[PDB]
Design a binder for this molecule. Structure first.
Ligand SMILES: C[S@@+](CC[C@H](N)C(=O)[O-])C[C@H]1O[C@@H](n2cnc3c(N)ncnc32)[C@H](O)[C@@H]1O
Ligand SMILES: C[S@@+](CC[C@H](N)C(=O)[O-])C[C@H]1O[C@@H](n2cnc3c(N)ncnc32)[C@H](O)[C@@H]1O
Ligand SMILES: Nc1nc2ncc(C(=O)O)nc2c(=O)[nH]1
Ligand SMILES: Nc1nc2ncc(C(=O)O)nc2c(=O)[nH]1
Ligand code: SF4
Ligand code: SF4
Lengths: 209, 209
């Protein structure tokens, strides 16, 4: 059984695969924040701008098994078109994402990507693993495909992240009342340390889902 | 001898490698348009928004040999930092970019990308070949790494482009008085045909060189 907040088909707004058509499956619930604004000030992760509470979003609901979830995901894809790709996010997807769901997605011809905070062990069979480390949280996933760090966070050892085993190293401006400020920072960082690339949240500029 | 409009160090604004730190070497001159406004209305390529006339830009000038040009390019890179990468553009870089310049850059530890209109044969030794086919120009480069097509153009055969031998297929909204309009078109195209990804000119939103 799976608790999904919302399922929608759009272009990936951020990360190394920005611009790529994909179905986003946003799981409900996270392990680093309840989702309530009264808890944010003392949460482990306090800068989240995503609503992952409940199952009331678009195509959201409580799915009984993987095939029921895959059917909904596959249904959102343009008929007769290949290159099927799903992004598992939330929320923290590793709270619910299991192997039976992964096998069912691969069976449907879907490539699987995951956006995880890195505080939980991930499934190796996932095609693209994106880790976004939270500074005040433990990081148990020290290898993957891309490391997308949101800056700035206090207690952050940014240069130490480059020692990890990832193919892509990105910094992403923290959105909020200081987005433009943090963007300047991220750009300045990459230029000074060219190992890092900029991850822009393009979907917030293009105003797309 | 090389005639270069401008050489500047920034983050790549568009394409498959958006956000990646790189030195941009903008060669002067093009073969599909003279650069004169008086010639635009009758040109093969009429939507160019780039100044490539002369050598009066930042770090621009006539470079006698490859070593002189490479020295300026390398000089823009952060001292002590690796991951050296140069994007050869213009203008049409294949009007000037030869093998000695490639070998000199490779000897300087630089990875080489190229932005070309595809009307001229390219050097195979170039690490990243990005082709942006113009609708009313011959396309002799039918293979490479990145096929970044600017839409919409009249007489364009968009679907046929996807048959070519490229790893990435991108559509990029034609900037101008209808950029927001073209962006919606591009987004719609990728969603209807998920082989294509969106190439957004991020540097025009982030306001960076
Ligand atoms: C909402 S999280 C869901 C996945 C998981 N909980 C995580 O933290 O990776 C999706 C992505 O957006 C990033 N993100 C969250 N809040 C953000 C904010 N205010 N500004 C920028 N990126 C943010 C996260 O770091 C993560 O990379
Ligand atoms: C200025 S061109 C130089 C490289 C080469 N002359 C070419 O056409 O690819 C660099 C890139 O910008 C794109 N471009 C030029 N004018 C544009 C415009 N008005 N809107 C969007 N992209 C544009 C070109 O298609 C190309 O991909
Ligand atoms: N376009 C788009 N890309 C996105 N990429 C990632 C995430 C996420 O993991 O939360 N969310 C979005 C989103 O809402 N829209
Ligand atoms: N940031 C940035 N990226 C760019 N990427 C490509 C091209 C080009 O080939 O013309 N030009 C720019 C530019 O001016 N700025
Ligand atoms: S870990 Fe991710 S989903 Fe959870 S609160 Fe932080 S940003 Fe939001
Ligand atoms: S071919 Fe490229 S450089 Fe030449 S006018 Fe067209 S867009 Fe500009």
């Amino acid at each position: 059984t799976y608790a999904v907040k919302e399922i929608f088909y759009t272009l990936q707004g951020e990360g190394a695969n920005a611009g790529r058509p994909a179905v986003f499956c946003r799981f409900a619930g996270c392990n680093l924040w309840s989702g309530r604004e009264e808890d944010r000030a003392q949460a482990v992760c306090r800068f989240c701008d995503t609503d992952f509470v409940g199952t009331d979003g678009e195509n959201g609901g409580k799915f009984k098994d993987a095939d029921a979830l895959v059917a909904t995901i596959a249904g959102l894809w343009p008929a007769g078109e290949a290159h099927r790709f799903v992004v598992c996010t939330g929320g923290e997807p590793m709270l619910q994402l299991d192997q039976p769901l992964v096998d069912a997605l691969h069976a449907a011809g879907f490539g699987i990507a995951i956006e995880t905070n890195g505080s939980l062990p991930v499934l190796e069979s996932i095609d693209w693993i994106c880790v976004s480390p939270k500074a005040d949280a433990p990081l148990v996933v020290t290898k993957g495909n891309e490391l997308k760090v949101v800056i700035p966070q206090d207690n952050q050892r940014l240069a130490d992240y480059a020692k990890l085993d990832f193919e892509y190293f990105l910094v992403q401006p923290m959105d909020g009342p200081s987005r433009d400020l943090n963007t300047k920072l991220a750009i300045d960082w990459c230029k000074r340390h060219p190992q890092w690339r900029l991850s822009m949240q393009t979907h917030k500029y293009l105003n797309i889902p």
